[PDB]
Amino acid sequence: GGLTCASAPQGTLRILEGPQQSLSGSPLQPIPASPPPQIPPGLRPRFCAFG
Amino acid sequence: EPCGLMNHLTAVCEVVTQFVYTASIPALLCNLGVTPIDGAPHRSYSECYPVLLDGVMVGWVDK
Numbered sequence A: 001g002g003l004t005c006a007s008a009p010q011g012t013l014r015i016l017e018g019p020q021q022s023l024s025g026s027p028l029q030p031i032p033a034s035p036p037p038q039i040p041p042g043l044r045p046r047f048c049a050f051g
Numbered sequence B: 001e002p003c004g005l006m007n008h009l010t011a012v013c014e015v016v017t018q019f020v021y022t023a024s025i026p027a028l029l030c031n032l033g034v035t036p037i038d039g040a041p042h043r044s045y046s047e048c049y050p051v052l053l054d055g056v057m058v059g060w061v062d063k
Helices: B025-032
Strands: none
C-alpha cells in the first residue's frame, strides 16, 4: 500500500512564454544628423569706410 | 600628478540611484524560458547560459 518507483519518464517538456520580433525600421532620430550652421539671408555689410 | 586618475562624467552619463522591488523578475525570467537552479536544464549544462540577477543565480537559460 506504499508508494513505489514507476517507469522512467520517456520525455521532458519545458514551457516558457515568449513574444516575437517586429520589422526593422531603425528610426534613428526625431530631427536627425548634425544639422549644419548656415548663412542668414542677405545679411548686408554693417560697416563702411571713411570718405 | 592626478592625470588618468581623476576623471569626469560625460554630459549624458548618469548614476543610478533608484531602488525597486525586483521580486517579480525571477518569476518572469522563468516564463521567458529560463529553468530554475533546481533542475531539468533540457540540455547539457555546457550548451546553457548561467543566468544571474543581482548576485542570485536564477540559472541556466538554454543556449
